[PDB]
CSV table of C-alpha atoms in Angstrom, one decimal:
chain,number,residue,atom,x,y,z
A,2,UNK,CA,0.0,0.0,0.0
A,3,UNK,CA,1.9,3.4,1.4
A,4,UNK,CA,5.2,1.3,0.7
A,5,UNK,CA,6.9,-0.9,-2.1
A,6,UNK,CA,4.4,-4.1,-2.8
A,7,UNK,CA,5.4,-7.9,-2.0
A,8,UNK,CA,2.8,-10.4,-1.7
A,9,UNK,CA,4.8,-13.3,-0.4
A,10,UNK,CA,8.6,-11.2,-0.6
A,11,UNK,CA,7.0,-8.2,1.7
A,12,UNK,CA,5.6,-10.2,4.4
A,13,UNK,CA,8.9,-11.9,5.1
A,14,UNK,CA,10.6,-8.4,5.2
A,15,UNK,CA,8.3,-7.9,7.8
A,16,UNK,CA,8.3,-11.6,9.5
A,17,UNK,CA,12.1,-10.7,9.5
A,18,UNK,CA,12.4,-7.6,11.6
A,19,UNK,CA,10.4,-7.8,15.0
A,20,UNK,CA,10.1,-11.4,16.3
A,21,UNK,CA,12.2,-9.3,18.8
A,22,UNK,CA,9.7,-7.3,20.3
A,23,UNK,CA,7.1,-10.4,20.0
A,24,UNK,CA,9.4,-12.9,21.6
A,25,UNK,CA,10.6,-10.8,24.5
A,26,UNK,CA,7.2,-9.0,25.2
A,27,UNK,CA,6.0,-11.8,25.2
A,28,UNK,CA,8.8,-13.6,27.6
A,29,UNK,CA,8.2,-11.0,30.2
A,30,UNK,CA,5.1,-12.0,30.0
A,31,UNK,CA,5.6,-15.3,30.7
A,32,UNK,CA,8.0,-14.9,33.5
A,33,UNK,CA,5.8,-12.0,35.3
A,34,UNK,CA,3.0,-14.7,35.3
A,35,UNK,CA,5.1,-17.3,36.8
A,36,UNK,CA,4.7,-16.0,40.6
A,37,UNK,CA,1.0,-16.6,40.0
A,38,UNK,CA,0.8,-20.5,38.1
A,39,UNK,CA,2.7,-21.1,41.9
A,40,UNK,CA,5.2,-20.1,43.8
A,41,UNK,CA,2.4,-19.6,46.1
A,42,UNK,CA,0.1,-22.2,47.7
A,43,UNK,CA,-0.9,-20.0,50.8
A,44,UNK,CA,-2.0,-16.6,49.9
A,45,UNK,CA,-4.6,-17.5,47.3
A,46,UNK,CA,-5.6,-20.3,44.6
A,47,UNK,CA,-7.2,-17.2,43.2
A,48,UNK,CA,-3.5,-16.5,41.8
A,49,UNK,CA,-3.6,-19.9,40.0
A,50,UNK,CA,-6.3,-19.7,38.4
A,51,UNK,CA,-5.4,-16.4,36.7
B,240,UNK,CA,1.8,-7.3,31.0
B,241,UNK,CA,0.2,-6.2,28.4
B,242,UNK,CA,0.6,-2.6,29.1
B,243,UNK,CA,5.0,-3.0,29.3
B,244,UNK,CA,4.1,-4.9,26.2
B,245,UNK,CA,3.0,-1.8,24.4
B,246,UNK,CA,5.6,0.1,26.1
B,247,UNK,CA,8.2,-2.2,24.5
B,248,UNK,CA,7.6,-1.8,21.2
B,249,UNK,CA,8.1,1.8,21.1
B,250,UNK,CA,11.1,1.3,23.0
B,251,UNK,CA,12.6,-1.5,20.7
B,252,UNK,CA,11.2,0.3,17.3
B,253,UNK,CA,13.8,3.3,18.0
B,254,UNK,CA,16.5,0.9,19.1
B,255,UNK,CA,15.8,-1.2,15.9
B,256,UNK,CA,15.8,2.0,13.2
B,257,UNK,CA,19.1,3.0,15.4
B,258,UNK,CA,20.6,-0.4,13.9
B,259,UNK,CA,18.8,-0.5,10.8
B,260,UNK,CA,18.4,2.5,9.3
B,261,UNK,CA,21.5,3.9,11.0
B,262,UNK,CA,20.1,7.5,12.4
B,263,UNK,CA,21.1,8.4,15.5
B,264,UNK,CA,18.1,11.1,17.2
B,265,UNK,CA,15.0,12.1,17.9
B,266,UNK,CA,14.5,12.3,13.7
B,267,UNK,CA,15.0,8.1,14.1
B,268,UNK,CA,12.1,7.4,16.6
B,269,UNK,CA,10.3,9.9,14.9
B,270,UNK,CA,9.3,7.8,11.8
B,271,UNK,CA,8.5,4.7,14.1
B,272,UNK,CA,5.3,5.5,15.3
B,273,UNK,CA,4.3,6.2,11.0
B,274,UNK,CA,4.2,2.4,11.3
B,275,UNK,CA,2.8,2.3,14.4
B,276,UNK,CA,0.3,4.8,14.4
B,277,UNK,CA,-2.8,2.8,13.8
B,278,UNK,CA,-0.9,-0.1,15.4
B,279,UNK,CA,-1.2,1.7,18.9
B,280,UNK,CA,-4.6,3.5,18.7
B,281,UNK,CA,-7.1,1.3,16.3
B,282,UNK,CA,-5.8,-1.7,18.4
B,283,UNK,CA,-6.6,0.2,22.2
B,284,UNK,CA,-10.2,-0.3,20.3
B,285,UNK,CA,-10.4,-4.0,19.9
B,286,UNK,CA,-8.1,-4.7,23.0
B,287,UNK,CA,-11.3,-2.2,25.0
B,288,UNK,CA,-13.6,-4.4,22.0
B,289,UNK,CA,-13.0,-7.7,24.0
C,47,UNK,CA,31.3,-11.4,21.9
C,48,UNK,CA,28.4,-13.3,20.0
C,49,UNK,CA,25.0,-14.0,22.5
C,50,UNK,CA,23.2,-12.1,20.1
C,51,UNK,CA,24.5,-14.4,17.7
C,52,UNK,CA,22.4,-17.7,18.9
C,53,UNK,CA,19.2,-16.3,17.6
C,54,UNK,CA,20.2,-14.6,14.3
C,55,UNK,CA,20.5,-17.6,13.1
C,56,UNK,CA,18.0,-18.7,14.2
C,57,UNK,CA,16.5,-15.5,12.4
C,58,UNK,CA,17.3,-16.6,8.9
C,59,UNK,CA,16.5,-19.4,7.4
C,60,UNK,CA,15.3,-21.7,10.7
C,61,UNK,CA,12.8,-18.9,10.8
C,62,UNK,CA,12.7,-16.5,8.1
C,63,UNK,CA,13.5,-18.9,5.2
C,64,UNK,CA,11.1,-21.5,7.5
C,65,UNK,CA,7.9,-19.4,6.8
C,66,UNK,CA,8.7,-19.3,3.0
C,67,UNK,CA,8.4,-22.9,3.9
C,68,UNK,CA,5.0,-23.0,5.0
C,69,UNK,CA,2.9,-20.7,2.4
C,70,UNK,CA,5.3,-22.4,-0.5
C,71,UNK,CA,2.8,-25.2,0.4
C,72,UNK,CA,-0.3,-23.5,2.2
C,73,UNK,CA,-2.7,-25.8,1.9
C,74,UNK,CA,-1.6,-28.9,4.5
C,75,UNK,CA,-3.0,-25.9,7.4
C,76,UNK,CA,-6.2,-25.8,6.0
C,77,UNK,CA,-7.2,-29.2,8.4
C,78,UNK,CA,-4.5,-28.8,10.4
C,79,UNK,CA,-6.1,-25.4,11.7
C,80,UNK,CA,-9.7,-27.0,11.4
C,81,UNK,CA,-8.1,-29.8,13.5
C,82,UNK,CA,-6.6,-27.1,16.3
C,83,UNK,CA,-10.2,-25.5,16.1
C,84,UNK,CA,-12.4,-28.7,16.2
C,85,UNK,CA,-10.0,-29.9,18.8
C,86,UNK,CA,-10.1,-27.2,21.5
């Protein structure tokens, strides 16, 4: 559209350069969750289930 | 999560056109959010739309 | 040093070159999606 076309050649351009952002956004993620999955079988199960 | 999550790809963005594009400044991060325009305020929509 | 170098290869062609993979076929994820939908 607003750049240089690619049907199948444009979306590996973009499939090539930010798999950064959407692996490590997406690793915090992960990791910030992991207090709740356990770590904790006291305060509340409520944590678990979230 | 989710909000660092949006936080991090503005972040990343200017720290990938520093690499890429090879601009230094303000005028680098500048151009980022052309891509990422829509990508931060028609998505706030359907992320309130669930 | 090279720790950034244990994913850009993994970048290119295990991932990049990977997905040309994929949609060079296409059609084997029709069912295969149908099969993740109809199976959850």
């Amino acid at each position: 559209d607003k750049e240089g076309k690619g049907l199948i050649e444009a979306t590996l351009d973009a499939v090539r350069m930010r798999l950064r952002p959407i692996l490590m956004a997406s690793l915090a993620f992960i990791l910030g969750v992991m207090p709740l999955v356990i770590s904790t079988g006291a305060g509340s199960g409520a944590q678990n289930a979230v | 999560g989710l909000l660092v999550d949006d936080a991090i790809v503005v972040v990343e963005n200017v720290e990938r056109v520093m690499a890429e594009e090879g601009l230094p400044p303000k005028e680098a991060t500048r151009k980022s959010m052309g891509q990422i325009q829509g990508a931060l305020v028609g998505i706030a929509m359907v992320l309130s739309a669930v | 040093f090279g720790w950034f170098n244990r994913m850009f290869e993994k970048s290119t062609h295990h991932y990049t070159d990977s997905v040309g993979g994929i949609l060079r076929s296409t059609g084997r994820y029709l069912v295969l999606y149908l099969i993740i939908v109809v199976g959850m």
